[PDB]
Amino acid sequence: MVLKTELCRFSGQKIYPGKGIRFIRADSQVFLFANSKCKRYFHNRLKPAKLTWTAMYRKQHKKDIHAEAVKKRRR
């Protein structure tokens, strides 16, 4: 598909060349934001795991769980 690209360091999405906004930080780090939604989160100090649109979330569930213990007078 696309062979020349950047990668959004927030929302994960491929950024086309001739697109996006790159924040140059004072410590010389580069952060790549696909669009204005992406960069607002960074400025506001959102962790991407903090359910932003749900960026670097997506983590596995498990199943249900037993009725055991958690204070119920057994030993």
Added chain:
Amino acid sequence: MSHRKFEHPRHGSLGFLPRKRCSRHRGKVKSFPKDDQQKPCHLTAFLGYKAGMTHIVREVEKPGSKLHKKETCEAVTIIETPPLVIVGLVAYVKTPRGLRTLNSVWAQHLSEDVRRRFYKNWCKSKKKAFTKYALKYDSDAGKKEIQLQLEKMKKYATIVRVIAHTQIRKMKGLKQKKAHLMEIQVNGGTIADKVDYGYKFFEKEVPVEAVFQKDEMVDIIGVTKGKGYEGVVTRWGVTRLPRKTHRGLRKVACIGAWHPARVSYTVARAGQNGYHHRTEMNKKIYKMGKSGQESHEACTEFDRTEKDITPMGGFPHYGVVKGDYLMIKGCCVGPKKRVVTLRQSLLKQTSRLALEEIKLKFIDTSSKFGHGRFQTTDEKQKFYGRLKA
């Protein structure tokens, strides 16, 4: 001076001075280059409807400034440019009052062409089977009339012109069904040959590829988007008057001087803005094509992957392109769903702007904001749907 010797250049051009409503919905170039070139394949203009705008990335090449070569983003206007039905060969003889038509020839078989044309051009939106155009002549009477014109043309050396009309009925997405009759000049060789060809040329369409060559600098002429009625500030580009508060903000202060008892034409005040005829010159025609049966699409992998030139979800307020397309450099005058005409550059010089072609890499036909690039990526989003999407 008289007062304050700190003076500014004048706001708003005097060559773009009457900012007022265009006479017709389609711009009409008032002169054309002179007949000096190839035979009546060379129409000097073609018409389309501005579809919207897209973007293309092209890999430059120059050396003067610091950075050069490598990819560059570019704006490009996409225009749907259907093949156009040339109706007639019209004989305009030059006079010392400027050109005068002697007669106009109309095709041998019009019965749908003039009937879609007719809610301006004439009037009434196809009701009871009416709005009348002349029906084709007696068989050998009408043919004789055409050849009588050939004699007149070939004795004074007529500047050959063509009446054509835009068949917008080949497009669907644009809600207008109404053909626009227009005059496009024919350029080429000797009078006898060009006229003879021109008779045969109304018995068949003319495509995009046959009027413009790729790379060419083409002046694009249209009528700007209508904005409505607008202030001084956005009509002439004057300053706001500056204060904390002030009984006029978006205003000019003084519109003359005491002794000439009359307001100048050059002073800036409000009025209509937009819907103005304008010419915007020297636009590189990057690509000409069409959906399926002209162009391929793209060449796969590095070149680019196949991407239809419409953005997914269609152009806002236009329709969806699924036909002819023409990539003309940068911005283009007009809104969307208005006639734009392309007419070859009068300054045939070129010189060095582009010169060399500059192979199409990316189209930016944007389907993004979290997804996109046709088919597979759209499928990925649809996977997170399915039974309510």
Added chain:
Amino acid sequence: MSKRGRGGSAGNKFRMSLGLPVAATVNCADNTGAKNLYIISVKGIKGRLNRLPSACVGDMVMATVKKGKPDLRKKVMPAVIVRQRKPWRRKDGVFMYFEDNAGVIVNPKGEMKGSAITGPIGKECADLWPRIASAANAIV
């Protein structure tokens, strides 16, 4: 009569968004002991009526030292803007902006007047002024 050229910078290569008018306070990104510069004028510009001269990344700028050590203080020296918080557009089409607005004080020879840079330097600045480039911790 004609003033003879050189000095004033050169023809940028892009059209750039003005971020710093006159009378702005702008960080000193070198270790002369100066720790605040004041942009007073722009070295190269031609302006017009009412409109404040404004400068941007890579431009040659005129500055006075507002605060720091008294040796630097209240002297007027040329400066080059190394960073500006207003976006710069590169040819490729990505927009690059910096965290802070900073300039360095520079010699009239275009060599640094400062011991070292701190923070990144724009590619644009390095091209125009190659002796800012050879003072650079980082070039982006």
Added chain:
RNA sequence: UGAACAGCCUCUGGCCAAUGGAACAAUGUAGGCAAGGGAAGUCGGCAAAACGGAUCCGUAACUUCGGGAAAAGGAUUGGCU
């Protein structure tokens, strides 16, 4: 709710009469918001705007020792259990 006879919402009591309809253009009037910069605007920070309540910490040269003082400047503030 909250110090509140503050504001806001509501009870009780009282109106529904503020000519009505349509478009909702520029231009006004009245109300908001603006990236980056931050008074360079201007005779002048005019008002917009920001600060703001409180608890804790911290508090100046000076002074008629009473004050300045809520100086400045910071941090804190929920739901629920």
Added chain:
RNA sequence: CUUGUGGCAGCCAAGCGUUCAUAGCGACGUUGCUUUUUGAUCCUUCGAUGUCGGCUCUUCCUAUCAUUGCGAAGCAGAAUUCACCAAGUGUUGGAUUGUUCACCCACCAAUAGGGAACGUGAGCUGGGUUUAGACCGUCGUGAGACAGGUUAGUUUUACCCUACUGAUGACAGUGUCGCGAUAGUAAUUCAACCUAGUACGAGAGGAACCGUUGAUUCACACAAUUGGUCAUCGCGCUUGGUUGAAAAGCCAGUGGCGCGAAGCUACCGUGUGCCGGAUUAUGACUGAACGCCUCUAAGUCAGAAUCCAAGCUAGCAUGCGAC
């Protein structure tokens, strides 16, 4: 009106300038022009022409600061200085003062000078001048005065007519496509690269032409992008209050907040902005007048940011053609 006073431009040429009156200047004088100083005047207006400055915007003027193209030089290069055609196009930001003016800082190709009811108040501001309050100093017995200072002090009305701006529009009817009369008219400036560490120069230094690329300022568009906007009250969040709760919502003159398409919009985003001719300045040709000789008398060539097309915008609604 006038032009003493002011400003600008000449004539003469004693001198200066190593030399050398006249590259550039120019005494003692002397002739003009202008109203860009201010008076003189009372012509006009006191049953009423709104003062000054600034803010803003225009047009014009040239005695042209720059740029275009040129002629001088005590122009080697180069700074620089002089003169010409020329208002085509620019001619700046701040600090302070009500001050325009002024005076600095700082940029620059350049930061020219003047006018338009001392341009510009039913466009503004109201800071100065110039009311009523008031303080101080001086003068005055006093009341008061002050070309002395200082502060606070109401800016009314356009809907009429024209101008201008845009909107429609009756001439067989109805309607098209054109033509293009006439009017308006646009691009500007700079640096880097190359030339070139070259020409030139003893060295120090140090070009331009041409070839190249972008910027600056202006103009004209457009929303791909990017940024801004939110009344999609679209979605989420949150507080107070209100539906007993649940759920789904209501009210806070748009409740507040984070986002937000579509639309609009930003040298706060992008892209684009034309070349032929006729000529000027000026250098020339041939060549008399003036046997020779001369850009000129006759004839004639090259030639400008000029001008006129080209081109671009109104489309003659009282021009017209074809259909």
